């Protein structure tokens, strides 16, 4: 968990993921691993986001995050 969160932590803070890369990723660790990596990912970028955004809707990162998980 620890070597595949320090791997999707790169993956998500980046735009346009290749997509070899991002198999190799998935075929090197477990369903379960992968998964729970992309959750704590998602949940420490929306995390850091809200602590960005505390000053109100000014600079919102929120829309970076979610066009990170449309791509």
Same mark, same amino acid.
């Given at each position: 968990?620890?070597?595949?969160?320090?791997? @999707?932590?790169?993956?998500?803070? /980046?735009? %346009?993921?290749?997509?070899? +890369?991002?198999?190799?990723?998935?075929?090197?660790?477990?369903?379960?691993?992968? @998964?729970?990596?992309?959750?704590? /990912?998602? %949940?420490?970028?929306?995390? +850091?986001?809200?602590?960005?955004?505390?000053?109100?809707?000014?600079?919102?990162?929120?829309?970076?995050?979610?066009?990170?998980?449309?791509?």
């Amino acid at each position: 968990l620890a070597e595949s969160v320090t791997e @999707v932590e790169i993956f998500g803070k /980046a735009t %346009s993921i290749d997509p070899n +890369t991002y198999i190799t990723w998935i075929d090197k660790y477990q369903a379960q691993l992968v @998964v729970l990596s992309a959750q704590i /990912a998602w %949940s420490e970028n929306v995390e +850091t986001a809200l602590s960005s955004m505390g000053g109100g809707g000014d600079a919102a990162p929120l829309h970076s995050v979610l066009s990170n998980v449309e791509v």
